């Protein structure tokens, strides 16, 4: 039935546990991420672990050698949904240069290169916009600066980093609609990509990360307070009649 929970990671477990490897991969390294990002993604529990309170915590840190570490976790090859309401409940980090995201890449990536394999950004935030999040799709002929994007601001001039909020896409054949705290803020359909190919009617895998630095967010400054935590209470996929 519509609204049935089809799949989830609720991040149950004791404080200091690793994320479940049957669900998540850790991407690693400080190269190739594009966007002039600074962070070195690691598989260390210093950058991703459960908190014992039912949350995944991804932590961006500055190391003694001046490098920044964080985590970038994906479900590639482990869980690849096609359609559904894809929702995470997240308390995002804050501060200049911090760039948290919950997003998806097409299952055919990288054999089908980006952006032909598709990318759906469910939530992105940049530190200089504590009251805003963005949702975007990238596809062939509509990618990068030409990604089809929308923005949601607030609540009541408040910072998203203050507490948990929900971020979702209601994803069906030929349509994606974005919701923050159950409120619509963006929508894209086969009809809005012009004469370009629609690449979203296929399985995608899920990604959670916190970047440090980038062309969009800019870079840490003297006000940036590290370490910063992104806390994720759950990632869920609900039946939506697809």
Closest to 178 (Cα-Cα) out of 159, 157, 151, 158:
151
**Of 1 and 22, CB closest to Ca ion:** 22
Q: Which residue is nearest to Ca ion (CB)?
A: 54
Q: Is 11 in the site for Ca ion (CB under 5 A)?
A: yes
Q: Which of 37, 87, 124, 175 is catalytic?
A: 124
**Separation of alpha carbons 152 and 129, rounded Å:** 11
Site for Ca ion in 178-207 (CB under 5 A): none
Contact 169, 235 (CB under 8 A): no
Residues 45-74 binding Ca ion (CB under 5 A) are: 54
Number of residues that bind Ca ion (CB under 5 A): 5
193-206 burial string, b = 16+ CB within 10 Å, else e?
A: beeeebbbeeebbb
Please state the closest distance from residue 12 (CB atom) to Ca ion, in A: 6
Q: 88 or 104: whose CB is closer to Ca ion?
A: 88
CB of residue 233 to Ca ion, shortest distance in Å: 4
Least distance between Ca ion and beta carbon 230 (Å):
14
- Would you call 124 a catalytic residue per the annotation? yes
Pick one of 18, 233, 239, 242: the residue that binds Ca ion (CB under 5 A). 233
Whole-number Å distance between alpha carbons of 86 and 7:
10
Q: Beta-carbon neighbour count of residue 72 at 10 Å?
A: 22
From 5, 7, 8, 10, residue interacting with Ca ion (rule: CB under 5 A): 10
Contacts of 93 (CB under 8 A, 6+ apart): 60, 100, 127, 161, 210, 228, 229, 230
Strands 56-62 and 68-70: antiparallel
Query: Which residues of the chain form contacts with Ca ion (CB under 5 A)?
Result: 10-11, 54, 233-234
- Residues with a catalytic annotation lie at 119, 124
């Amino acid at each position: 039935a519509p609204g049935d929970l089809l799949w989830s990671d609720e991040f149950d477990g004791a404080a200091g546990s690793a994320p479940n490897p049957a669900v998540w991969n850790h991407e690693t390294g400080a190269h190739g991420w594009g966007n002039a990002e600074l962070q070195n993604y690691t598989a260390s529990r210093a950058n991703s672990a459960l908190d014992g309170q039912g949350n995944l915590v991804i932590t961006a840190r500055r190391e003694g050698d001046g490098s920044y570490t964080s985590a970038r976790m994906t479900t590639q090859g482990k869980y690849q949904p096609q359609y559904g309401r894809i929702e995470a409940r997240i308390q995002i980090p804050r501060g200049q240069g911090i760039w948290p995201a919950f997003w998806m890449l097409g299952g055919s990536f990288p054999g089908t290169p980006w952006p032909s394999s598709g990318e759906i950004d469910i939530m992105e935030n940049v530190g200089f916009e504590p009251h805003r999040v963005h949702g975007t799709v990238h596809g062939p002929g509509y990618s990068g600066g030409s990604g089809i994007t929308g923005m949601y601001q607030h609540p009541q001039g408040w910072s998203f980093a203050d507490t948990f909020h929900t971020f979702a896409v209601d994803w069906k054949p030929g349509e994606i609609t974005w919701f923050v705290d159950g409120q619509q803020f963006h929508r894209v359909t086969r009809a809005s990509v012009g004469a370009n190919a629609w690449v979203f009617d296929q399985p995608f895998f899920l990604i959670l990360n916190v970047a440090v630095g980038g062309q969009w967010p800019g870079y840490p400054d003297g006000t940036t307070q590290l370490p910063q935590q992104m806390k994720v209470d759950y990632v869920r996929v609900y039946d939506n009649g697809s």
